Amino acid sequence: ETIASELKAIGKELEDQKKEENIQIAKIAKEKFDFLSTFKVGPYDLIDEDIQMKIKRTLYSSLDYKKENIEKLKEILEILKKNSEHYNIIGRLIYHISWGIQFQIEQNLELIQNGVENLSQEESKSLLMQIKSNLEIKQRLKKTLNETLKVYNQNTQDNEKILAEHFNKYYKDFDTLKPA
Amino acid sequence: ETIASELKAIGKELEDQKKEENIQIAKIAKEKFDFLSTFKVGPYDLIDEDIQMKIKRTLYSSLDYKKENIEKLKEILEILKKNSEHYNIIGRLIYHISWGIQFQIEQNLELIQNGVENLSQEESKSLLMQIKSNLEIKQRLKKTLNETLKVYNQNTQDNEKILAEHFNKYYKDFDTLKPAF
């Protein structure tokens, strides 16, 4: 092909990405909006730095490292955390998906670091396609977080409208209050 | 007389509300959920401790000094502060009403501390009825804020429902995600 030349290149591409995000992520904990650093889905959950790293990677990346959107994500997660019934679905986003993706990427990166020559032709073929599926997932996710955010923003907007009109109704003066 | 006897008692009355709230408010001060202590309606607004005291009095009172409802009020005010257009209507609640009420209360308390005997019969009557209107309003406000907390609570609820539903739809798995294109 060479598939082993492709593979090695596709591995340098994502090992660069990793270095870019490593920096971008470093700055966010510098500027102090790295909520994921402390984030636990439940009360007494243990937090592993390496598992969180992976999660930051995908979540901060999809959000384009923007502070406004990372704050907005934090608020969404915080809202859902209130009800133990939402613990599971949050984990699916935070772990199964956000960590899960980085985990697959790391195994892929490893198979390449181990030597593409030590791979059967058909193994090299799966690795390549597998990598590409992971890259595609990242994008699917990015497009879903975009919607997640457009839904949250709308909601926030509606709440503002409602709240403001309630104030400009019962709060014009004393006369506009609650008769007993 | 003897509206004098009435006034005097309606005064030790609201002077009691003051010592109780003074304590209740004091607690909230070290329990560090007293946002009114640092709350400005606008960017570079000056904060007077005495004017804030009055506001805490009515605001924290109407919220039976419940730490949670006080947090909820803080969030409502914070949300509206974002748009400059809402500066006025916030002030009407915070100042004209919340401070305004305590201010009238203090003048009333003073007329009594000054001596009810130094008051005409006409004056004595108006004072009494005026006090009662203040004590009436103090309730209107309490009941209104509660409705306000309901409006906020409802909204919060709706947002939870919407968000969860969205989450369950898209985050169930990799396959539930939106298309890449």
CSV table of N, CA, C and O in Angstrom, one decimal, chain A residues 24 28 30 32 51 58 64 68 70 78-79 87-88 99 107 109 111 134 143 165 168:
chain,number,residue,atom,x,y,z
A,24,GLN,N,-3.4,22.9,25.3
A,24,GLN,CA,-4.7,23.5,25.4
A,24,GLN,C,-5.4,23.1,26.8
A,24,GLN,O,-6.0,24.0,27.4
A,28,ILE,N,-6.2,25.6,30.4
A,28,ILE,CA,-7.5,25.6,31.0
A,28,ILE,C,-7.5,25.4,32.5
A,28,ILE,O,-8.4,25.9,33.3
A,30,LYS,N,-4.9,26.3,34.1
A,30,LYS,CA,-4.1,27.5,34.5
A,30,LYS,C,-5.1,28.6,34.7
A,30,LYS,O,-5.1,29.3,35.7
A,32,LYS,N,-8.1,28.3,35.3
A,32,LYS,CA,-9.1,27.8,36.3
A,32,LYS,C,-10.6,27.6,36.0
A,32,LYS,O,-11.5,27.9,36.8
A,51,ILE,N,-8.0,8.7,34.0
A,51,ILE,CA,-9.3,8.5,33.5
A,51,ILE,C,-10.0,9.9,33.2
A,51,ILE,O,-10.6,10.1,32.2
A,58,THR,N,-11.5,14.5,25.4
A,58,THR,CA,-12.7,14.6,24.5
A,58,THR,C,-13.7,15.7,24.7
A,58,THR,O,-14.1,16.3,23.8
A,64,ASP,N,-14.2,22.9,21.7
A,64,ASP,CA,-13.2,23.8,21.2
A,64,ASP,C,-12.5,24.6,22.3
A,64,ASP,O,-12.1,25.8,22.1
A,68,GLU,N,-16.6,29.6,27.8
A,68,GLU,CA,-18.0,29.8,27.9
A,68,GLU,C,-18.8,28.4,27.7
A,68,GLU,O,-19.7,28.1,28.5
A,70,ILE,N,-17.4,25.3,28.1
A,70,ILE,CA,-17.0,24.4,29.1
A,70,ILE,C,-17.8,24.7,30.4
A,70,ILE,O,-18.2,23.8,31.1
A,78,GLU,N,-24.2,19.5,36.2
A,78,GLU,CA,-24.7,19.8,37.6
A,78,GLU,C,-26.2,19.7,37.8
A,78,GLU,O,-26.6,19.1,38.8
A,79,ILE,N,-26.9,20.2,36.8
A,79,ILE,CA,-28.4,20.1,36.8
A,79,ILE,C,-28.9,18.6,36.9
A,79,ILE,O,-29.7,18.3,37.7
A,87,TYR,N,-27.9,9.6,37.0
A,87,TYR,CA,-26.5,9.2,37.2
A,87,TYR,C,-26.0,8.3,36.1
A,87,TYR,O,-24.9,8.4,35.7
A,88,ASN,N,-26.8,7.4,35.7
A,88,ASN,CA,-26.5,6.4,34.6
A,88,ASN,C,-26.2,7.1,33.3
A,88,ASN,O,-25.1,6.8,32.7
A,99,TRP,N,-14.5,8.8,27.9
A,99,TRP,CA,-13.3,8.1,28.3
A,99,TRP,C,-13.1,6.9,27.3
A,99,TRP,O,-12.0,6.7,26.8
A,107,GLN,N,-5.2,2.3,22.9
A,107,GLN,CA,-4.8,0.9,22.4
A,107,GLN,C,-4.4,1.0,20.9
A,107,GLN,O,-3.4,0.3,20.6
A,109,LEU,N,-3.0,3.5,19.3
A,109,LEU,CA,-1.7,4.1,19.4
A,109,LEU,C,-0.6,3.1,19.8
A,109,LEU,O,0.5,3.2,19.4
A,111,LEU,N,-0.7,-0.3,19.5
A,111,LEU,CA,-0.5,-1.3,18.4
A,111,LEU,C,0.5,-0.8,17.4
A,111,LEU,O,1.2,-1.6,16.8
A,134,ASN,N,-13.0,5.6,15.1
A,134,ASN,CA,-12.8,6.4,16.3
A,134,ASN,C,-12.8,7.9,15.9
A,134,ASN,O,-13.5,8.7,16.6
A,143,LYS,N,-20.7,17.0,17.2
A,143,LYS,CA,-22.0,17.5,16.7
A,143,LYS,C,-23.1,17.3,17.6
A,143,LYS,O,-24.2,17.9,17.4
A,165,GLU,N,-40.5,38.5,32.9
A,165,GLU,CA,-41.9,38.9,32.9
A,165,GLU,C,-42.7,38.7,34.2
A,165,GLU,O,-43.7,39.4,34.5
A,168,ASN,N,-41.6,41.8,36.2
A,168,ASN,CA,-42.3,43.0,35.7
A,168,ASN,C,-43.8,42.8,35.8
A,168,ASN,O,-44.5,43.1,34.8
